[PDB]
Amino acid sequence: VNWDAIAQCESGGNWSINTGNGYYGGLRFTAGTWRANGGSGSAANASREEQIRVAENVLRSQGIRAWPVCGR
Structure with a gap:
């Protein structure tokens, strides 16, 4: 799915x-x-891709x- 678009809505794009x-990270975990x-x-502290990887599990x-x- 479009994780970048979701992150913009959740935190304005700030992944760190x-x-x-x-809540932490761009996806607010x-x-x-x-x-x-x-x-x-x-x-x-986790990278964008690493955050996206965990989001796939969620x-x-x-x-x-x-x-x-x-x-x-």
Whole structure:
């Protein structure tokens, strides 16, 4: 799917964002969802491709419903 378009809606495109609001990275991952789908450390330090790779696992276990508005 178009992950770049989804990321723009979720964080304006900043893949390395860590506002400390509980969500990390351009796709706004929680620490739980991140690792539980094959993530190392924090999503804010993880590369774009590595974030996209973990998102593919999220999309397969939870679905596109993980991004209620930006998943469109």
